Write a protein that binds this ligand. Sequence first.
Ligand SMILES: N[C@](CCCC[B-](O)(O)O)(CCN1CCCCC1)C(=O)O
Ligand SMILES: N[C@](CCCC[B-](O)(O)O)(CCN1CCCCC1)C(=O)O
Ligand SMILES: N[C@](CCCC[B-](O)(O)O)(CCN1CCCCC1)C(=O)O
Ligand SMILES: [Mn+2]
Ligand SMILES: [Mn+2]
Ligand SMILES: [Mn+2]
Ligand SMILES: [Mn+2]
Ligand SMILES: [Mn+2]
Ligand SMILES: [Mn+2]
Lengths: 335, 335, 335
Amino acid sequence: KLLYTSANFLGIPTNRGQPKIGTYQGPELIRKSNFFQLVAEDGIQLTDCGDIIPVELNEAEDPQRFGMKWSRSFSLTTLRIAERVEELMKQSNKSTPLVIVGGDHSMATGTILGHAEAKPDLCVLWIDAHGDINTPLNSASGNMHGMPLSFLVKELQDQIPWLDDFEGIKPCLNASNIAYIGLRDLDAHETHDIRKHGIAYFTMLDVDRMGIEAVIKEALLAVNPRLEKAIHLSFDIDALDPLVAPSTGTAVPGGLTLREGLRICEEVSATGKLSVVELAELNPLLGSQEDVLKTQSSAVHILRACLGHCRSGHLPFKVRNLTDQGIMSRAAHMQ
Amino acid sequence: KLLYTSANFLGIPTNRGQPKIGTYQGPELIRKSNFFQLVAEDGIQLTDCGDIIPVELNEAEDPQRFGMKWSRSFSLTTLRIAERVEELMKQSNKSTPLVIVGGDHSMATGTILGHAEAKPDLCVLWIDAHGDINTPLNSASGNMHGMPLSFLVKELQDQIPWLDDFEGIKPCLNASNIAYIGLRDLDAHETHDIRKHGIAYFTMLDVDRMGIEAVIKEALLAVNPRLEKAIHLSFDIDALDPLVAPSTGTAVPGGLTLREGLRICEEVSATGKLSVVELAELNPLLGSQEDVLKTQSSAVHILRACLGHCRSGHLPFKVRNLTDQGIMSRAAHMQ
Amino acid sequence: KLLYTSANFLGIPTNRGQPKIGTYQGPELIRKSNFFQLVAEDGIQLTDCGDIIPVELNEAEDPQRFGMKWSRSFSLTTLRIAERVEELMKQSNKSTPLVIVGGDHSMATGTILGHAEAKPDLCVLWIDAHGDINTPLNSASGNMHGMPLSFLVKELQDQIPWLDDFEGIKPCLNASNIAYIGLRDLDAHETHDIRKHGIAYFTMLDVDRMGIEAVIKEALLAVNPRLEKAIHLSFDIDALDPLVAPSTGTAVPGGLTLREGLRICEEVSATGKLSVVELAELNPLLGSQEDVLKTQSSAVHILRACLGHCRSGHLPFKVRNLTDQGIMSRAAHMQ
Ligand SMILES: N[C@](CCCC[B-](O)(O)O)(CCN1CCCCC1)C(=O)O
Ligand SMILES: N[C@](CCCC[B-](O)(O)O)(CCN1CCCCC1)C(=O)O
Ligand SMILES: N[C@](CCCC[B-](O)(O)O)(CCN1CCCCC1)C(=O)O
Ligand SMILES: [Mn+2]
Ligand SMILES: [Mn+2]
Ligand SMILES: [Mn+2]
Ligand SMILES: [Mn+2]
Ligand SMILES: [Mn+2]
Ligand SMILES: [Mn+2]
């Protein structure tokens, strides 16, 4: 009756991928919610595997290199994440999805690296207002959370500066293994690289013209045609409209409705191939108390959909009967 | 020019169907609005028939029975509502719609009972995030507003515990006479009963995949194929997204847009078969002042659509002419 | 690579078309934003042409005439606007769009008058919750911002009272040159005139049933079939849902989503025929600080779309290369 009967939960409180303090509280925002209770109510055994501890160096240890901010904290954290995800995914070999809560999106380099170590032929569905595929010299901001895919994509490696501490970060993705949904604020050089190397992408313009149902279908068609590959679903909460997810660092108006977001996750879940889902860029320190509650709520509904929650309802495990308790029913009484 | 030239208005301030104080202020929230003025401006004669006084017993008189909270207050209130609705609907036999403002949704047992007494072959369109069809032993909450349909549906009576004071509450609905729109938070046993007895239902997943236009059509097709039956439209305000109706007790993210809600009401109205519309679960004591204003506004637009308001405009009753006032026009002056 | 490489920007702080103080701050709300910076980042040369100074008479000089409030301030302002727009549009003869920020919508009589002087065969796309086509004796409010089209439409001139100071305001539009999108709160006499004279209109009901893609297509088909005519896009910010544009004087629930608004502007822009776009009814003195920020944001995204911003991204003018800086890439290092 369930596609996934077990799941693992991992927190990754990354906060050195971008300058706004608070993404480190992301995992706790979800733990404080009713997520676990709701998942159990659906019959799923969810194991909290704790948090990864990011490496956070001081300024002296981690100066700017090629404009990148905290790049050694990044490289060390990436390797620590990858090791943990790899070992979690290998104990998993009905499959057992890994649910990851961030943390800023710089964590994705590590999670995908480790995931691909366990499952080399995976595909990536990237749900985001942003491309997150800036190579270091093209990044105006120097924020690592805008670069995580660039280190992973083989076709881009002539645009990545060599750093010794980045050697263990091996490019494990082909451009043909990635599909974007939700884009609406690409940098020019991202647009260039995406089009040049033929990365499948469906922006909010595409969602408007095609509808989310067709977009989801085409995205899966592009990178997982016959559902042969494990899916890495990388969900940036800022893919959703700021009206439903205001508490995040780089919000952009005109996003996915919660319903559109749910449809993406419902379809990905229903493939039976959801291997890892990560939810990035929750920041409970941004916005009002009600803003945080809305963002939390949206996140929980999204993550539930990923694990197979159905808005059309679930059947009970044991159907209750009235006579079993020795109780007279109205139907019984009338006869 | 008008499908309905007259209408009746009834308040039912039920608040013993659920524990949050404030649904009793629902009718006043609408009376305080510009609803009446706007309805008159469309040429409709709307008569305020006052409020039904719910029976509210004290704890000693109304202890828990079969887990139900305030079940004798419920049974007595149900009978009082039914008597009033029946007499209102029988004076009505262009038909004259009855507009009912709640009050929590437990009132629906009474309104439908009385309605069916006047019009036995009616159908029910239930617009709600919830099923409201829990039988008493399956209800974790014991809140009557989550059970009103269960006492009315004939196929469910082997699951209703017999109570003497419930005898006058006769099941008057076949499962085939009900269609849901907007569901997104069903209890497992509700899901079971709905599927088992073939109740037509269109959840938010269905709305996403089909679109609201097709959903409305299919819902009417399922329970009123040739528009032969009077329609009881039971509209829970929490069917709408919390962004447009935050002031309600059990809000669930990812609801109908106001526009989707308007389309439901516009189509139901246009059948010429709208016999009763009830609007449930307004709670002006929940949320901020602006939250209440939004919910009020959404409710007024919804109720106006039910009575035939057209967003594409109405024609004037008397067309004004310039020369009638003895005034020189620009066209006149240029000649 | 760009449809429009240059554009002009004009502020018109009209505030005598309606009684709520604050629309005069509209132009500054946009100047304070990052609009100019973002437009430049797309490669467009935008020239700020300053503000038009409206004529604002005192009460003694400008008493009510035919129920109209501030009608001489209106007639004088209209002529001053028209002169300025005409001279701006004639210096413009890749064309150079004129972007106008209001100001209440009464400015439209002046902007269209001047525009048509430069381009007599123009068409008008009116994006609004309201018709703004009340003739003076039918207007209950007397607010000029609800009448600007009535003075321009030739077919309506037998319903316009003659005033000497209105002589220079010559009707320059045929009813067949106008198409509405977004209507949802028409006055009865507006509905009458619109239907009587066959003005193309697509209300929110039409948007719901047809979808915005079809609506845009049909609107352009109705008034600009072969893209032969210059387009005057008159965008009332209250066309958008109050959830995304709360800071405006006459907000009506159930409006266009920001995305739907963007699609309108994206398609109009892509015709290559966008000649003038005006954005009306911004009022930074209404609503909360966050309300103003949302409205500002929505306005900037809308105006950017008009000038050709693409949500699917732009290509860089110069593609950056790694070796040009004398830097070793990862690809280089591995060989
Ligand atoms: N691409 C940006 C944003 C990165 C956000 C990372 B995410 O998706 O985890 O929140 C810069 C975006 N860009 C900035 C200026 C104007 C256009 C968009 C960057 O800093 O590289
Ligand atoms: N079905 C619920 C909600 C009833 C709401 C009545 B309405 O539609 O008038 O507002 C309980 C819902 N349920 C609770 C736990 C998790 C799943 C949903 C119940 O209490 O029976
Ligand atoms: N049509 C109205 C609104 C004008 C708004 C001008 B805009 O689009 O620049 O904001 C009156 C609307 N009308 C009022 C009563 C009920 C129905 C709608 C008027 O005052 O003429
Ligand atoms: Mn992002
Ligand atoms: Mn991201
Ligand atoms: Mn409900
Ligand atoms: Mn209900
Ligand atoms: Mn308007
Ligand atoms: Mn207007």
